[PDB]
Amino acid sequence: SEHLRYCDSILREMLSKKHAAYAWPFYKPVDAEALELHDYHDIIKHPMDLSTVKRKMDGREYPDAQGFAADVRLMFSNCYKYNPPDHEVVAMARKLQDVFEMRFAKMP
Ligand SMILES: CC(=O)OC[C@]12CC[C@H]3[C@@H](C[C@H]4O[C@]45CCCC(=O)[C@]35C)[C@]1(O)CC[C@@]2(O)[C@@](C)(O)[C@@H]1CC(C)=C(C)C(=O)O1
Ligand SMILES: [Cl-]
CATH number of domain containing 60: 1.20.920.10
φ/ψ of 49, rounded to 5, equals: -155, 175
Beta carbons within 8 Å of 43's beta carbon, 6+ residues apart: 81, 82
Nearest CA to ligand 1 atom 29: 83
Which experimental approach was used here?
X-ray
CA distance 84 to 86: 6
Cα 87 to Cα 28, 42, 99: the distances in Å are 19, 20, 19
CA of 66 to the centre of ligand 2 (A): 7
Long-range contacts of 83-89 (CB under 8 A, 24+ apart): 89/25
Nearest CA to ligand 1 atom 24: 35
CA angle in degrees (0–180, nearest 5) for 88-38-53 = 60
C-beta separation of 30 from 79 below 8 A = no
* Ligand located closest to 48 CA: 1
The answer, yes or no, to whether any atom of ligand 1 lies below 6 A from the CB of 89, is yes
The DSSP code for 33 is T
CA distance 48 to 77: 10
Cβ atoms within 10 A of the Cβ of 75, count?
Answer: 23
Q: How many CA atoms lie within 13 A of 38 on its CB side?
A: 0
- Give residue 60's region: left, alpha or beta (phi > 0; psi -120 to 50): left
* Residues of the domain holding 32: 2-106
Structural resolution in Å: 2.9
* Ligand located closest to 44 CA: 1
Ligand 1 atom nearest residue 83's Cα: 29
* Number of domains making up the chain: 1
